[PDB]
Design an enzyme around this catalytic site. Sequence first.
Site, PDB file in Angstrom:
ATOM      1  N   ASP A   1      -1.527   6.295   1.985  1.00 49.15           N
ATOM      2  CA  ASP A   1      -2.341   5.485   2.874  1.00 49.15           C
ATOM      3  C   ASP A   1      -1.588   5.083   4.130  1.00 49.15           C
ATOM      4  O   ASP A   1      -2.224   4.826   5.151  1.00 49.15           O
ATOM      5  CB  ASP A   1      -2.846   4.253   2.136  1.00 49.15           C
ATOM      6  CG  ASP A   1      -3.858   4.599   1.063  1.00 49.15           C
ATOM      7  OD1 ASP A   1      -4.561   5.621   1.211  1.00 49.15           O
ATOM      8  OD2 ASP A   1      -3.951   3.854   0.067  1.00 49.15           O
ATOM      9  N   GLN A   2      -0.257   5.055   4.089  1.00 53.36           N
ATOM     10  CA  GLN A   2       0.516   4.804   5.301  1.00 53.36           C
ATOM     11  C   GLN A   2       0.377   5.959   6.288  1.00 53.36           C
ATOM     12  O   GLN A   2       0.299   5.749   7.507  1.00 53.36           O
ATOM     13  CB  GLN A   2       1.973   4.542   4.913  1.00 53.36           C
ATOM     14  CG  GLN A   2       2.886   4.076   6.020  1.00 53.36           C
ATOM     15  CD  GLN A   2       3.554   5.215   6.735  1.00 53.36           C
ATOM     16  OE1 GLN A   2       3.473   5.333   7.952  1.00 53.36           O
ATOM     17  NE2 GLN A   2       4.244   6.056   5.979  1.00 53.36           N
TER      18      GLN A   2
ATOM     19  N   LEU B   1       0.843  -1.184   0.000  1.00 51.39           N
ATOM     20  CA  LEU B   1       0.000   0.000   0.000  1.00 51.39           C
ATOM     21  C   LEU B   1       0.882   1.240   0.000  1.00 51.39           C
ATOM     22  O   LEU B   1       2.018   1.216   0.480  1.00 51.39           O
ATOM     23  CB  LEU B   1      -0.956   0.034   1.195  1.00 51.39           C
ATOM     24  CG  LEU B   1      -0.453   0.387   2.593  1.00 51.39           C
ATOM     25  CD1 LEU B   1      -1.620   0.848   3.436  1.00 51.39           C
ATOM     26  CD2 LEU B   1       0.212  -0.796   3.262  1.00 51.39           C
ATOM     27  N   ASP B   2       0.347   2.324  -0.547  1.00 52.26           N
ATOM     28  CA  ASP B   2       1.154   3.497  -0.831  1.00 52.26           C
ATOM     29  C   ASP B   2       1.361   4.334   0.426  1.00 52.26           C
ATOM     30  O   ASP B   2       0.659   4.178   1.430  1.00 52.26           O
ATOM     31  CB  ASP B   2       0.497   4.327  -1.928  1.00 52.26           C
ATOM     32  CG  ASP B   2       0.374   3.560  -3.230  1.00 52.26           C
ATOM     33  OD1 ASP B   2       1.189   2.641  -3.453  1.00 52.26           O
ATOM     34  OD2 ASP B   2      -0.538   3.869  -4.027  1.00 52.26           O
ATOM     35  N   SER B   3       2.343   5.240   0.352  1.00 50.19           N
ATOM     36  CA  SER B   3       2.769   6.001   1.522  1.00 50.19           C
ATOM     37  C   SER B   3       1.706   6.989   1.979  1.00 50.19           C
ATOM     38  O   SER B   3       1.651   7.334   3.167  1.00 50.19           O
ATOM     39  CB  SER B   3       4.065   6.746   1.218  1.00 50.19           C
ATOM     40  OG  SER B   3       3.823   7.796   0.300  1.00 50.19           O
TER      41      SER B   3
END
Lengths: 87, 68, 176, 459, 102, 39, 128
Positions: free
Chosen positions: A45-46, A41-43
Site C-alpha cells: 500500500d505504500q 500500513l504495508d509496503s
Amino acid sequence: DAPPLTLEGIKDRVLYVLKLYDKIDPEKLSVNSHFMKDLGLDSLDQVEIIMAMEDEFGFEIPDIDAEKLMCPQEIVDYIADKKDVYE
Amino acid sequence: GKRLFIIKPSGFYDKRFLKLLRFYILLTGIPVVIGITLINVFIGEAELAEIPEGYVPEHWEYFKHPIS
Amino acid sequence: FLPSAAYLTHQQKVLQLYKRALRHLESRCVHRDKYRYFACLLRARFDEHKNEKDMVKATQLLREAEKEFWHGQHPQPYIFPESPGGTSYERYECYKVPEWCLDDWHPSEKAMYPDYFAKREQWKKLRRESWEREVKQLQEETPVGGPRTEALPPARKQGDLPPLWWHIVTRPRERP
Amino acid sequence: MLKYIIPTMMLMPLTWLSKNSMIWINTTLHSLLISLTSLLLLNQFGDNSLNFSLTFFSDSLSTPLLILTMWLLPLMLMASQHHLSKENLARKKLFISMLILLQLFLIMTFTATELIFFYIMFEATLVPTLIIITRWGNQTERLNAGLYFLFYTLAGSLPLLVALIYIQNTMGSLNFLILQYWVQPMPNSWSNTFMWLACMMAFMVKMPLYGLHLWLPKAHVEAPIAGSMVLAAILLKLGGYGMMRITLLLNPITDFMAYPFIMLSLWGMIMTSSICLRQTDLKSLIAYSSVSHMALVIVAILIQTPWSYMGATALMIAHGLTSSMLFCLANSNYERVHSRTMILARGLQTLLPLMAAWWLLASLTNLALPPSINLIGELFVVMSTFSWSNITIILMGLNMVITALYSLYMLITTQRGKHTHHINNILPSFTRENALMSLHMLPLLLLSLNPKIILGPLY
Amino acid sequence: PTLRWQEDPEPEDENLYEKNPDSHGYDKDPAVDVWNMRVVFFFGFSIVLVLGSTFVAYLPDYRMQEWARREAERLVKYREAHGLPLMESNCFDPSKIQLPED
Amino acid sequence: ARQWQPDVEWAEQYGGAVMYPTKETAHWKPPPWNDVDPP
Amino acid sequence: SFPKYEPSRLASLPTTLDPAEYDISSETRKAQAERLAIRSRLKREYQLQYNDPSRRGVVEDPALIRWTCARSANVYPNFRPNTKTSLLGALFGIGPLIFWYYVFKTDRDRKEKLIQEGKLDRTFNISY
C-alpha cells in the site's frame, strides 16, 4: 503553462490526498509520521501511495527513490526538489 | 517575485560581429547602388543603330550598358 | 545497476513488478472505475499467497508471474510526459545553459546586472575558499582503498558545506 | 599573366622586411588586393581562349580555378594563426612565405601552356605541401601521412613524364593549340593503351579513385588547416583540370579501355559514402566526402559529354569551396576542444549561438541544396551519365541519399542536443572565425545567383 | 629510478580573453587587432566583394551570348523571308567535297 | 606544448649499424664515435 | 499461457525473464559486488577530477581515447591474411564490381547494337 506553486501548496495537497486514503485515519496524522512504523500500513500500500502521488502531480518518480520515502515530510521535500519550487 | 533571471550565453560577440558585418558591407553597398542608379537614369544605355557607310567603330560602342 | 547496492532485493523485484503491472493496467484499462476494480483484483491476487514461508517457492511464483505478465503487457503504455520515452522528456533541454558559463560576458552586460553578479561573486568565493582542505580531507579520510559504495558522507564535523556539492546545487531550474 | 606572376613574387620579401606584428596586416591586405586584380582577368570570349604569351594562356576552365586560388590564399593566410601565433618569428615568416611560394607554383600550374611545363609545376605544387604538413602536422603520424602522400603522388605521376616526352618527340610541340588542331586518332594497339593508362593513371592517383584513396585521409587528419584546405581544394581540382586538358588526345581508345575506371569510381563512390557514415575523427568525414565527390568528378570526366564537362567544372569549384570551409569549421571546433573526435564535443546549440548557422549552411551546401552550385554540378553529371546508360542512375541517387544522410548526421552529432557539462573551457566565437565563414559562403551564394562564370569551356 | 624527460609541464591553455574584453579574434595587442578587423572587413568586403559583384554582374557579353541572340534573330528573319528552310543541313557544301570511290 | 615531437624511443630505432635487424644482422655493433678502434 | 519469448539479435532479452537471474550462485553475488566497487571507484575519481574550481579544460576520458585509437590506428596490427579474411575480402571487394561491370557491358552492347540498327527513339535526342 502558468502555474504558481509554493511549499505551502505542495504540503497541503500531499497531506490532503494522504488524508483522503481509506485505511488510515485523519485523527492521528501529523506531517511528520512514518508509514510502516506508526501508521502501520504495508509496503504494498505504500507503493500504492506513491502511485497516487505520481498520478496526481503528473510525473514519475523512480523506484531507485521509491524504496525510501516512507514519510510525508520527505515526500513534500522530494517533489519540491523535482519541481524546483521557488521564486 | 514572478520574474526570474534567465541565462543566455554571451550575445555581445554575436551582436558586435553582426553590426560590423552589416556596416562594412553597406559602407560601399549604398554608394555603389546610388552610383549605378544615377548612371542608368542620367546617362542612357544606347540605341541599336546600324554601322554607317565608310566608318569603323572601336572595341567599345558594341555594348548596351554604359558601365560595361 | 543501482548506486547504493549491487542486487536490488527479492522484495524490491516483486515491488517493481507490482508497480509496472499496475501502471500497464492503468494504460490498458480506461474509465478508471473498471480500472479500480481490476487493480483491487490484482492486489487480492498478491494477497492470496503473500505469506508463504519458503523462498524457492517465492522465486517460483515470481518467475511465473513475470511470464504471465510479459504475456499480457500493453504495447504503448501511458508513460508520463517527463519519463524517458515520454511526450516531453527534456522538452526544455533547449534552455538549460549551464552556470560554468555566464562569466564569459563583456563587462557592459555585467554592468547591466550588478546585484546578481555580485552575489555570484560571493558564491564563487564560497566555492573557492571551502574546497581544498575540508572536502579533500573528508574524501581521503573516511574511505578504504576501495570505496565499495557511491553514497558520500555529509559534512558533520564542525562547520561548512558538504563535499562535492557544486554541480548538484547549481543545476538549472528544469522549467526555465 | 605576368602581371599576376610578378606581384606574387613581390609579396614574398614583403613578409621578410615587414617588422614584428606587422607582417600579418601587410600580407593579408596585399593578397586581398591581388584577389581583386585577379578578378579583373575575366575577359574570356567566344571563339578562342586568351593568350598571355606563348608561355601563358587561359582557357575558361582555368579562369575560375585561378580566381579560386588567388581568393583562397588570403582566407588561408588569415586562417592559420592561433596554432602558430605562439611560435617564433622566423618560423612564422617561413610558413607564410611557403604558402606564398605554393600560390606561385599553383598559378604557374593553372596557366600552363605546355604539358611539360604543366608536369614540372604540378610536382612543384607537390613539393612545399610535404614540408608544411610535416613541420606543423600537430600529431604523431604526420611522418606517415607526408610520406604516403609523396610516394603515392610521385610513383603514380612519374611515367606521365615519359608519355609526355614521347608525344613531344612524335608530334612536335606541346602547346595546347598545336597539340590541338593536329591531333590524330590513335588506334587500338597495346602501346597506345599503355600510354593512355600511364597518363590517366597518374591523374587517377591525383584525384584519387577508390583503389588509391588512402593517400588522402591521413594527409588531412594529420595536417594543419592551411595544408588541408589547399591540399583538398586546389590540388584535387588541379588534378581534375589536368585530366580535362590532356584528354583531348587519345579519342578512340577511351571507349575501348575506359570501362573499368568508371566501374571502380562508381562502386568506390558508394563504398566511400558508406564508410564516412559511421566513423569518428570529425576531420576524416570531409576527407572521404571529398573522395566521393571526386569519384563523381572522375565519372564525369571519363564520359565525354559537354553537359558532363560543364557539370564537372561546376562540381569542382563548388566542392572546393564547401570542403575547404567545412575543414575550417572542424579546425574551429578542434581549437575549442583538443579532441579531434566526434562523440565528445556535443551540445553547441545552446552555447555558441551563431556557429549553428554556419554549420547548417555549410552542411546544406554539402547536401546539394538546389539553387547552389553543388547541385548544379551533380545534376548535370546525373543527366550525362543517364545519357551514358539507363541503369547507372540508381548508383547516383543512392550516393545522393547516403550523402545527405552522413552530412546531416555530421550536423546533428556534434551540434545537437546536450552539452556534456564537463567541458567548461570553450569561449564565445571570435570575429576571426566568423569572418572566415563569411569569406567562404558569400562567394558561393553570389555564384549561385549568376553561374555563367564557372561553367567551363563548353558554355 | 628514471624519468626520461626534463622539459616543462605543458601547456597552459591560452584564454585569449581575460586581458582584453573588447578583443577581436587574435592575440593581446590592442591596436593591431583593431587594424586587422578593420582591414579584413574593409579590404575584404567593402572593396572586394561588392565591387567584384558589380564587376562580374555585368561586363562584356561573356562567351558571346547576346551577340548570338541578335545574330540568330537577323539570320532567322532572313532565312524565313527567302524561302529556304532555316538551318539547312550539311553545313559543308557537297560541291566542296570529294569522296573516296568504291 | 600540444605539438607532438619524437620521443627517446622514436630515435632509439635509428640505432645500431643497420636499420632492420634480422636473425643474421644482430652482430653489427655501432661504430666508435672517434673512428678509433681500441688496440 | 506464454509463447516463451524467443529472442533474436535485434529483440534483446529483457532484464525480467532471464531466467538465469532466479537461480543464483554466491560467486555471482561476489561479481556484482566487485562490479559495483569498480563503478564506485571510477565515479569517485571522475567526481574528484570534475569539481575542481581551478580546472579549466576537458576531463581527458581515457576510455574514449583508448576506443578511438583501438578503432582507427590499431586495426592494421594485429592482422594476418587468413582463408576467411581473404575469401571475404575478394568477395566484398571484387564480386559486386565485376557484377555491375557485366551488366554495364550487357546494356552498352544492347544499346550500340540497337542504334546500329537505328530503331531507338532518337527522333530528337539532342542534349546527349
